[PDB]
Design a protein around this ligand. Sequence first.
Ligand SMILES: *C(=O)N1C[C@H](NOS(=O)(=O)O)CC[C@H]1C(N)=O
Length: 250
Amino acid sequence: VNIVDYSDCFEGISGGAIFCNTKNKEYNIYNKELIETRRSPCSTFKIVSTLIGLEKGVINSKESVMGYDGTDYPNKNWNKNLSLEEAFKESCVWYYKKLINKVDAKSVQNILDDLKYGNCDISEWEGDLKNGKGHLNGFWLESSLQISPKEQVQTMAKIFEGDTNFKKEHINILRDIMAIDVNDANINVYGKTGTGFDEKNKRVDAWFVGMLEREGDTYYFAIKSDDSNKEITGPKVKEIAINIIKKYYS
Ligand SMILES: *C(=O)N1C[C@H](NOS(=O)(=O)O)CC[C@H]1C(N)=O
């Protein structure tokens, strides 16, 4: 366990980072206090909800559809019968809400328990209804479910090293749709952003969680901001993560 200083890459934004190589057990941590603090996963939960949907047969492949009903949304890409791959990349809320609401709560509780997914608290299934967004809410979006960045890394490692009961076929679908292009062919990066605002504490929850493969070595990582500036989003924290990867993990 090495404490490290990645502040240069955060460019003034408050946050922390954790990278873990489970082969040679090297855990690199920037802002240990924050890395151990549980927060809403926001859209990073789509990593797990995709696997839940595959395991329960709600969806079956990166092509699978959820039966778009014509509802109007501001994001143009949400207004179509999009595939799993496109819903994941567009972070399409209605698709993932419809997917999870086809799964019984006890099945979800038991999967989160098995994964040790933070507090595993799905008690507020419908999410943070006081924000007015109605059915565009759920337990994973600034609601009852909370997970620390370290726990995110621990969960990703267990999934992608083959240490859960999820089917290998389903893990590979997830890997496929999580892959990102960082304009460096010598590292494979996979991840998912998340964005929320913690109304209680007046701070963002901005995430980028995933893994890095570079010649035999694999690093599981979570980068997290808790800045008070509402302009700090998941996508911005993903840029910070990419800078860290290129600087220190190339
Ligand atoms: C998930 O965090 N969300 C869904 C969507 N995409 O977020 S992302 O760009 O950080 O990946 C919009 C923000 C957020 C939400 N409000 O539901």
